[PDB]
Amino acid sequence: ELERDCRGQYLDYEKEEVEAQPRQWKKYDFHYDNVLWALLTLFTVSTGE
Amino acid sequence: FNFQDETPTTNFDTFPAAILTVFQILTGEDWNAVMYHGIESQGGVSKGM
Amino acid sequence: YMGKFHKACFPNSTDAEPVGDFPCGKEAPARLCEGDTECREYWPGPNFG
Amino acid sequence: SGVNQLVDIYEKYQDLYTVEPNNARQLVEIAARDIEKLLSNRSKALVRLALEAEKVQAAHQWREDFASNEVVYYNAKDDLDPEKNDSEPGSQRIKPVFIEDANFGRQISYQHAAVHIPTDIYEGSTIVLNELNWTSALDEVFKKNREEDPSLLWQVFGSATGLARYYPASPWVDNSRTPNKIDLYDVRRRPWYIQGAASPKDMLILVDVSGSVSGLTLKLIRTSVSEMLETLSDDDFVNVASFNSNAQDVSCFQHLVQANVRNKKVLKDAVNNITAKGITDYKKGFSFAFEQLLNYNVSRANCNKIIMLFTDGGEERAQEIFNKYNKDKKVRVFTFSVGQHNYDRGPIQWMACENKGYYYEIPSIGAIRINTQEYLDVLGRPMVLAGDKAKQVQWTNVYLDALELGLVITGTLPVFNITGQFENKTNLKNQLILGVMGVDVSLEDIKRLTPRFTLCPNGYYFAIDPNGYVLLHPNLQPKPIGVGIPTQEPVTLDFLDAELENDIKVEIRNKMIDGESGEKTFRTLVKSQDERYIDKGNRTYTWTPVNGTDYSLALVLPTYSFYYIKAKLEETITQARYSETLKPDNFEESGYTFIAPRDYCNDLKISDNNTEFLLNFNEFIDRKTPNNPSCNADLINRVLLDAGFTNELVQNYWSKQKNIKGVKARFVVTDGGITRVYPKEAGENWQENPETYEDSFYKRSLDNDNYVFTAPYFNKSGPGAYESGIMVSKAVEIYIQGKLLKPAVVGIKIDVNSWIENFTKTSIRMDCVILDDGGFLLMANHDDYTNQIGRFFGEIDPSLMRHLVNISVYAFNKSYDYQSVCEPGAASKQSCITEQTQYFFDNDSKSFSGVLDCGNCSRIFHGEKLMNTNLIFIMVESKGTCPCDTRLLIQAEQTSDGPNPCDMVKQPRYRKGPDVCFDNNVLEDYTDCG
Ligand SMILES: CC(C)C[C@@H](C(=O)N[C@@H](Cc1ccc(OCc2ccccc2)cc1)C(=O)NC(C)(C)C)N(C)Cc1ccc(C(C)(C)C)cc1
Ligand SMILES: *[C@@H]1O[C@H](CO)[C@@H](O[C@@H]2O[C@H](CO)[C@@H](O)[C@H](O[C@@H]3O[C@H](CO)[C@@H](O)[C@H](O)[C@@H]3O)[C@H]2NC(C)=O)[C@H](O)[C@H]1NC(C)=O
Ligand SMILES: *[C@@H]1O[C@H](CO)[C@@H](O[C@@H]2O[C@H](CO)[C@@H](O[C@@H]3O[C@H](CO)[C@@H](O)[C@H](O)[C@@H]3O)[C@H](O)[C@H]2NC(C)=O)[C@H](O)[C@H]1NC(C)=O
Ligand SMILES: *[C@@H]1O[C@H](CO)[C@@H](O[C@@H]2O[C@H](CO)[C@@H](O[C@@H]3O[C@H](CO)[C@@H](O)[C@H](O)[C@@H]3O)[C@H](O)[C@H]2NC(C)=O)[C@H](O)[C@H]1NC(C)=O
Ligand SMILES: CCCCCCCCCCCCCCCC
Ligand SMILES: CCCCCCCCCCCCCCCC
Ligand SMILES: *[C@@H]1O[C@H](CO)[C@@H](O)[C@H](O)[C@H]1NC(C)=O
Ligand SMILES: *[C@@H]1O[C@H](CO)[C@@H](O)[C@H](O)[C@H]1NC(C)=O
Numbered sequence A: 001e002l003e004r005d006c007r008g009q010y011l012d013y014e015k016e017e018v019e020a021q022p023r024q025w026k027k028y029d030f031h032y033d034n035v036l037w038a039l040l041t042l043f044t045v046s047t048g049e
Numbered sequence B: 001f002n003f004q005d006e007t008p009t010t011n012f013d014t015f016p017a018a019i020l021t022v023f024q025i026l027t028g029e030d031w032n033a034v035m036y037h038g039i040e041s042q043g044g045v046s047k048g049m
Numbered sequence C: 001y002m003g004k005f006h007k008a009c010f011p012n013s014t015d016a017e018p019v020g021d022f023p024c025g026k027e028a029p030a031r032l033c034e035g036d037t038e039c040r041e042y043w044p045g046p047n048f049g
Numbered sequence D: 001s002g003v004n005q006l007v008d009i010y011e012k013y014q015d016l017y018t019v020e021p022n023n024a025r026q027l028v029e030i031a032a033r034d035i036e037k038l039l040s041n042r043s044k045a046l047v048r049l050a051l052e053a054e055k056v057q058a059a060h061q062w063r064e065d066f067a068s069n070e071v072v073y074y075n076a077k078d079d080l081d082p083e084k085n086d087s088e089p090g091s092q093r094i095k096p097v098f099i100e101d102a103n104f105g106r107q108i109s110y111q112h113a114a115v116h117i118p119t120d121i122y123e124g125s126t127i128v129l130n131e132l133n134w135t136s137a138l139d140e141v142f143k144k145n146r147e148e149d150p151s152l153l154w155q156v157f158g159s160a161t162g163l164a165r166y167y168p169a170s171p172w173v174d175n176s177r178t179p180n181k182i183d184l185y186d187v188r189r190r191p192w193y194i195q196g197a198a199s200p201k202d203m204l205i206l207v208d209v210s211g212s213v214s215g216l217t218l219k220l221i222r223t224s225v226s227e228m229l230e231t232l233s234d235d236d237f238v239n240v241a242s243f244n245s246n247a248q249d250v251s252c253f254q255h256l257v258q259a260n261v262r263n264k265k266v267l268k269d270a271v272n273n274i275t276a277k278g279i280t281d282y283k284k285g286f287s288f289a290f291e292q293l294l295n296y297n298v299s300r301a302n303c304n305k306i307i308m309l310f311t312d313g314g315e316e317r318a319q320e321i322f323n324k325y326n327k328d329k330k331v332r333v334f335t336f337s338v339g340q341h342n343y344d345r346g347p348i349q350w351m352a353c354e355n356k357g358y359y360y361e362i363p364s365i366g367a368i369r370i371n372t373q374e375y376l377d378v379l380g381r382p383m384v385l386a387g388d389k390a391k392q393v394q395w396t397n398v399y400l401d402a403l404e405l406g407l408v409i410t411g412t413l414p415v416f417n418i419t420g421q422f423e424n425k426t427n428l429k430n431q432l433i434l435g436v437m438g439v440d441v442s443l444e445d446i447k448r449l450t451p452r453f454t455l456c457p458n459g460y461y462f463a464i465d466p467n468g469y470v471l472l473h474p475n476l477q478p479k480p481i482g483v484g485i486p487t488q489e490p491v492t493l494d495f496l497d498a499e500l501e502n503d504i505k506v507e508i509r510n511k512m513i514d515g516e517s518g519e520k521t522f523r524t525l526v527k528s529q530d531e532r533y534i535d536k537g538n539r540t541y542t543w544t545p546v547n548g549t550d551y552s553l554a555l556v557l558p559t560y561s562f563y564y565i566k567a568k569l570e571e572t573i574t575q576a577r578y579s580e581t582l583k584p585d586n587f588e589e590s591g592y593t594f595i596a597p598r599d600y601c602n603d604l605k606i607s608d609n610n611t612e613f614l615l616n617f618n619e620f621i622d623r624k625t626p627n628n629p630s631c632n633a634d635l636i637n638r639v640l641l642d643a644g645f646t647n648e649l650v651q652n653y654w655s656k657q658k659n660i661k662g663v664k665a666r667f668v669v670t671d672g673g674i675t676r677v678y679p680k681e682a683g684e685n686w687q688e689n690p691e692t693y694e695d696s697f698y699k700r701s702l703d704n705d706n707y708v709f710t711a712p713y714f715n716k717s718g719p720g721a722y723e724s725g726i727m728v729s730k731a732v733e734i735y736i737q738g739k740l741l742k743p744a745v746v747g748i749k750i751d752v753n754s755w756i757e758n759f760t761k762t763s764i765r766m767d768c769v770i771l772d773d774g775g776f777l778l779m780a781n782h783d784d785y786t787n788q789i790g791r792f793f794g795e796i797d798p799s800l801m802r803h804l805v806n807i808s809v810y811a812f813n814k815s816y817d818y819q820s821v822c823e824p825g826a827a828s829k830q831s832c833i834t835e836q837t838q839y840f841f842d843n844d845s846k847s848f849s850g851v852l853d854c855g856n857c858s859r860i861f862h863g864e865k866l867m868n869t870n871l872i873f874i875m876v877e878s879k880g881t882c883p884c885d886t887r888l889l890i891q892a893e894q895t896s897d898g899p900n901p902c903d904m905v906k907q908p909r910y911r912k913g914p915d916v917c918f919d920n921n922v923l924e925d926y927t928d929c930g
């Protein structure tokens, strides 16, 4: 839960077979980090999708 | 809704969760996923439709 | 559309769970699949059937 | 066969050798001294390494910037490609030059130590980078240790941050970068690290199977309990309880049982078979836990009492249960909040505080592996505070090495954090160990300190744990121990399961565990090597404790094996005229020669392809004189003496005759290694092991002072029985100075047709069968039984087999093989416990008659045991009668489950636990509930 920690690799048990995946510090698709991004996020919320 | 491998966030366990789930079904978005969960909870398609 | 969502293409006679959550067909216009798989009967269907 | 000719040849050359005694007492004392010297050498290496690790971590300065000062190290999971772009910001990677070494069998670099960092651990964080910085002194002391003792195998620092730094730099096994080969190795789960990180436990896993744990929580709880059990050694005692308004055992065990492979499997099955239902009650569960930890009627390790609570959360603290049962705070309580939920986690975190424990969270699979290592991190606080009384070398059970070397035992020593010491500071985390240092001792390295070739092929050494497991035994194979029916554990094979179990052997095992010394001569059922016969042996066990360790060494020695022939070959020409017989160009006057692939000289490499080894042996014999200290003279002297005697037999008695109608092959096998089979035609049909000490018939024919016929294998794809024959052998029994010593076996491979014609020749003067020991049809008359020659007679007509057993002419012993490969069924090949049986002559009587009461019919038989052999003739006259073929007596290595563990823990085998253990210190700071 920090960008310092979120480096290297990790074991993913999602596939039901262990697989090593990279650790990526990502941002969500609709993310409110601006009044232009918040407008788009709120528009997509208002359309219901 | 305590399924194997997962527990949905849109569940009817407590009152805040139930009230939010009913609100989300009212707005119309993804009511079908909650329907599938509520059918699988009452036994399989076999006996809970 | 009766009973058309039940042919999923399964591994090579291993009797394991089918690969992919989509119906298939052994015919020409339907969705073929790939990777040593056989489009055979008895898959409950999409969305738990 | 010419027993007499080989005999009088042997007495004809008393001036060519000397007969020497096998004083078993001195042999055991010498081997025990050698083994204690080896283990003390490894202990000294460990002490050096641990001292330097503590000193060099005491003088370390913490940092957060490694860009300005890179750390240079070799990462084990680096690809051999010269990739300049495979470096972390704070670390520059070494690219080593790898040579191939004989000791290790892998690429080995002596110039630096390698490092293993688990995939789930980032290899450039601050903790990892600091550890990689201060372990370079460990690298240097690795070099020094290997420089003072060139026989060292892997010597390793198992860091508590996840790292592992072993000295001979070798690439990780198969898991560097390979699809479907994921690297789940973690040093802190390894048996040697688990062993050296703390003292033996008394767990009791309380699983909270109530209603609120259904779904994902129960999945994570059962996986977590499995992974918790996978961190318990054989010195640890554990039971698993489960409570939902009522506490009960999850399995058939009613108390704390030892945490060995079988019991751990039983507990794992019980936990996997568990279901969630009902209301929680934290008082009736902890009452059960504290009551089961108050049981002292059962065997235990009276140390480190623990309770592992696998719940999710709740609003119940149960203060009064703890104040009643745990008031002196003798019992820890580690609480685990498993699952992804929003229940209250306050009482869960409080039970750990008021009971010296710790609180762990397991939100999802992937968090399971780390928290078990972490309670073990907690348990080592009392060990740290005991400064130098806790630094003692301990050796683990026999296990299979990671960097594949075969079977090894690791000697561990923990490393203490000593930053603030004699200059006392806050000493925040000075209660945790830095890691554990281990050094591996190869089991084949222990085998070389117990020379076996001066003994009979029936005499051998074996060592033992305090738990009774064998450090060293002829029946210990490099395979994992089977635990049930197939559908990184240690190789823990008990002494009573590596052999046949009498009561005298239980007395001997108990005496060895206690560390006493003594001798015992008695009569033993010795199972043959092919696991198909049982002979009535004559043994003499002598044992001593190995001083300075927990091991106890013993030497099995047959009564006739008290003397051995010492070859007096010092003429340098007589050995040459013996040697000239061995090139594979004279295999027409002398027999087809095979040589035991022994360690005659180190420059010879043993080969599975025997004639290759024969060629190099001849080559080295061609120029042998300058290689005086290169190798042992005794082995080559004896093998050449035996080759000469065998040649004198094969020319002066076999080459004068050249042909007998009945025989198909004439062979002689000698303890030196010579096994010349005469015709050179059946030598292609010869399928016996080149090493004579592993020849089943040779070992069988020495205890049995008579003729032994080995029935060929049935339905085996190869040379078969018709075109090879059937084996016949008797052992020479020469006397020198009035002493009984048996140096060799001669034999005949009698042809099947030349016997069947003579057997049916006299029929004018149909059902007639010949049976040997073990009830195998050697040959018959009906000519359809002879189709199934060598096959077990019980498979032919099992009714007569059962009845003939009922007269008690054939006794049988059913035992277990825990190290056998196994075809997996349904609910490549896994390993199971196979349940092999062997038959033999119950009584010594010679004539047997009776009536077979077949169902609604009657059958008559007469049995006569041929004098001076292991055969019985059965005259039964009944074919195609009413069907009494209900079942079969299948003498075969049958897949089975082992002995019922729920019944074997109520009368457990005697076992001596570790003496000193560290728990419940008063200086320990409990205010770290996490
Ligand atoms: C109810 C229907 C008859 C008409 C209804 C509609 O079509 N909604 C969409 C879903 C939706 C919702 C919000 C959207 O963002 C525009 C917005 C945002 C906030 C408030 C008002 C408008 C876009 C799409 C729908 O699901 N349509 C189906 C036919 C049922 C499939 N819109 C709202 C009428 C409308 C649209 C645009 C405007 C202007 C702003 C003046 C241009 C004015 C009026
Ligand atoms: C079935 O076939 C022949 C039957 O003639 C068996 O060989 C004979 O065995 C008898 C046993 O008592 C011998 O007397 C026969 O002659 C012996 O030959 C040896 C050869 O070294 C002499 O030293 C003896 O003094 C004696 O004369 C012997 N004859 C032959 C030709 O072998 C044969 O053993 C038997 N088959 C099997 C498999 O045993
Ligand atoms: C062995 O014990 C010593 C001390 O008992 C450990 O050294 C100490 O480690 C802590 C980190 O847990 C250091 O605190 C850190 O300091 C840096 C810089 O001041 C700061 O940026 C961090 O936020 C954190 O506060 C501490 O300085 C360091 N030294 C002392 C004297 O306390 C050591 O880590 C232990 N060994 C291992 C292998 O962890
Ligand atoms: C393995 O094979 C050996 C073959 O000797 C078996 O040992 C024999 O077992 C029988 C059956 O229990 C013993 O007979 C019993 O003798 C006692 C004492 O006289 C008598 O009271 C009983 O009524 C019964 O007749 C026999 O003595 C014993 N042999 C020896 C030398 O002690 C053994 O049972 C087989 N199985 C195992 C697991 O070892
Ligand atoms: C780095 C900042 C760039 C942000 C551009 C994002 C595009 C957002 C489009 C906004 C759409 C608004 C719809 C609702 C208007 C009332
Ligand atoms: C397993 C297949 C057959 C199971 C029996 C039929 C169950 C489906 C019928 C119920 C559907 C409920 C929705 C009705 C909406 C009008
Ligand atoms: C082990 O020590 C005991 C007593 O210290 C001694 O009697 C015995 O000979 C020793 N054994 C060896 C192999 O040194
Ligand atoms: C122990 O080490 C010494 C020198 O360090 C060596 O001479 C001796 O042979 C070693 N012992 C064994 C059993 O290898």
Ligand SMILES: *[C@@H]1O[C@H](CO)[C@@H](O)[C@H](O)[C@H]1NC(C)=O
Binding pocket: D056, D069, D070, D133, D134, D135, D136, D137
């Ligand atoms: C730790 O790092 C510093 C700077 O790179 C280096 O001088 C020092 O030798 C390192 N410690 C050890 C034990 O090598």
Ligand SMILES: *[C@@H]1O[C@H](CO)[C@@H](O)[C@H](O)[C@H]1NC(C)=O
Binding pocket: D273, D274, D275
């Ligand atoms: C163990 O498994 C069997 C078979 O699934 C089941 O019938 C039994 O109830 C299980 N044990 C418990 C205690 O539930």
Ligand SMILES: *[C@@H]1O[C@H](CO)[C@@H](O)[C@H](O)[C@H]1NC(C)=O
Binding pocket: D294, D295, D296, D297
């Ligand atoms: C142990 O044995 C004693 C006496 O044999 C008995 O009273 C007690 O119930 C047994 N069990 C425990 C747990 O003490």
Ligand SMILES: *[C@@H]1O[C@H](CO)[C@@H](O)[C@H](O)[C@H]1NC(C)=O
Binding pocket: D521, D522, D523, D538, D539, D559
């Ligand atoms: C060994 O065998 C001899 C005869 O073969 C027998 O008299 C003796 O009792 C046996 N040894 C033991 C310990 O019984």
Ligand SMILES: *[C@@H]1O[C@H](CO)[C@@H](O)[C@H](O)[C@H]1NC(C)=O
Binding pocket: D609, D610, D611, D612, D615
């Ligand atoms: C064994 O080695 C010899 C000598 O090189 C060779 O002729 C023979 O083919 C080899 N046999 C096998 C099975 O490798």
Ligand SMILES: *[C@@H]1O[C@H](CO)[C@@H](O)[C@H](O)[C@H]1NC(C)=O
Binding pocket: D806, D808
């Ligand atoms: C032999 O068979 C009888 C009945 O068929 C049985 O009672 C007995 O146990 C068997 N074994 C012996 C050694 O008598």
Ligand SMILES: [Ca+2]
Binding pocket: D210, D211, D212, D213, D279, D280, D313, D314
């Ligand atoms: Ca509950």
